Amino acid sequence: XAXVXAXV
Amino acid sequence: XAXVXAXV
DNA sequence: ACGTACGT
DNA sequence: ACGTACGT
Ligand SMILES: *C(=O)c1cnc2ccccc2n1
Ligand SMILES: *C(=O)c1cnc2ccccc2n1
Ligand SMILES: *C(=O)c1cnc2ccccc2n1
Ligand SMILES: *C(=O)c1cnc2ccccc2n1
Ligand SMILES: [Mn+2]
Ligand SMILES: [Mn+2]
Secondary structure, eight states, rough: OOOOOOOO | OOOOOOOO
16 A cells, blocks of 8 residues: 555 | 665 | 566 | 565
8 A cells, every 4th residue: 555666 | 675876 | 467677 | 687565
């Protein structure tokens, strides 16, 4: 759920 | 992510 | 269930 | 002169 590199 | 010239 | 982020 | 960055 976090988006820092994918943002699921 | 390394920073040795840009640091991203 | 998911990888993005640069230049001296 | 090289890899760090999170939870809905
Ligand atoms: C977001 O909160 C989140 C948490 N755990 C994960 C595990 C695997 C893929 C994506 C995920 N996203
Ligand atoms: C994004 O591509 C990405 C990859 N790995 C991680 C590990 C820990 C926190 C955040 C991350 N983000
Ligand atoms: C940092 O770990 C890192 C890794 N690969 C990259 C590629 C392109 C721009 C920035 C990057 N940063
Ligand atoms: C910084 O500007 C920079 C440019 N190219 C590189 C190549 C290899 C290692 C580190 C680098 N840093
Ligand atoms: Mn991963
Ligand atoms: Mn987790």
